[PDB]
Amino acid sequence: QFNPYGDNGGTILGIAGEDFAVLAGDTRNITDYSINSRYEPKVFDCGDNIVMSANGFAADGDALVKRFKNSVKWYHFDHNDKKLSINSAARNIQHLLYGKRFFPYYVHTIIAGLDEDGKGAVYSFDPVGSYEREQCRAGGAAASLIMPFLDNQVNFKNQYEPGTNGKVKKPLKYLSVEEVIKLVRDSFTSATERHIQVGDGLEILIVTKDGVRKEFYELKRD
Amino acid sequence: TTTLAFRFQGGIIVAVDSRATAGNWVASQTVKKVIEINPFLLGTMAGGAADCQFWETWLGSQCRLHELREKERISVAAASKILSNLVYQYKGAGLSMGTMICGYTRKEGPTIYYVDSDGTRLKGDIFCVGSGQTFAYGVLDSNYKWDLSVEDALYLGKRSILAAAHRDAYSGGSVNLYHVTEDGWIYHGNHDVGELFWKVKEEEGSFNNVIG
């Protein structure tokens, strides 16, 4: 019987600081136990200071990204070149996904940019368009390895103030971009160690009020 | 999920947890399972995260159009019946929802409707809904009086979600609390179970099953 889905592996991760946000993903693409490519990007600049990744079944991921990019195009055409705010992108993507509720896109979607007060924002979606804003999200194959690390290191979960008798939590605080890139790089090297579908390369898109910058790092190729 | 809503002397209490799961994987601990439809209307979410979120924010748009067309806020009965007539059209397609539509109108008084994806619609004073519903019911039922003070009602609701969050593996995160009156709904905060459990154990002396 023909199976219209496949699984291309990889994993992605979004973190949001006070005045920036990052969206990272590995550059490996696989099917079964074969490597298709060691560098096939899956995080995209979509215009209006929004980056997007849709990880899982690549063909669905590409279709969705294509459709959203096109959605941004028409938003300009129809509303006098207005900037598409991240909250509005998120809601639009919900409708893109839920429109295929009965034949879903097999992807976990994350977008990142800046909210309307200039603060960093990360939004994540389930495959049929449930969504929520967070400081923090990993998605794709190694999500279950990386997410709990992020709860601990980004939101300081289960961490207390020494000598306060486990009565005073570590207080929340935004992270510098330098700190965030450190957590991203460590997250991915760890993930590469223990997950066979993650490796080869890491691409990070950083989003500030001056636009989108990229950084690339080698990852283990086994 | 665990969600509840009950009527009493002083209006309606609505309380929900904030956990989403995919199998045993805890997907989120920060889901907003109450949707604020209008200043006198609330909807609760349980079942498919997407199904609930999508159709309940769609419901809000339909209620807005009613008031533009009819120059009047929509009745709880009519708002709930839009949602239930919608899901009934999709019966068999595999939508998964258990929702309560909660609100006050002058013509109705405080009113709760239970609406689910098999197309069941029920008016009633007490409902609990979700995988944790039975746990919530156990506490709620055995302390419920029509005459609870607003203060006591709020606590009972909060405590009932706590009970379910503790025993049901698929409920947790935090409690969200609402009070609905003749003047609309009032939010009564987000309460992490992280700290709430220990606070309740200490102050109430319950949860002796647990290593203190």
């Binding site: 879903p104 389930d126 495959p127 049929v128 449930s130 | 999920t1 956990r19 989403a20 799961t21 995919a22 997907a27 989120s28 889901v31 399972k33 979410m45 349980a46 079942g47 498919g48 995260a49 997407a50 609930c52 998964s96 979700g130 698929y170």
Partner: peptide, 4 residues
């Protein structure tokens, strides 16, 4: 996709 998740449930609640």
């Amino acid at each position: 996709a998740x449930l609640x």
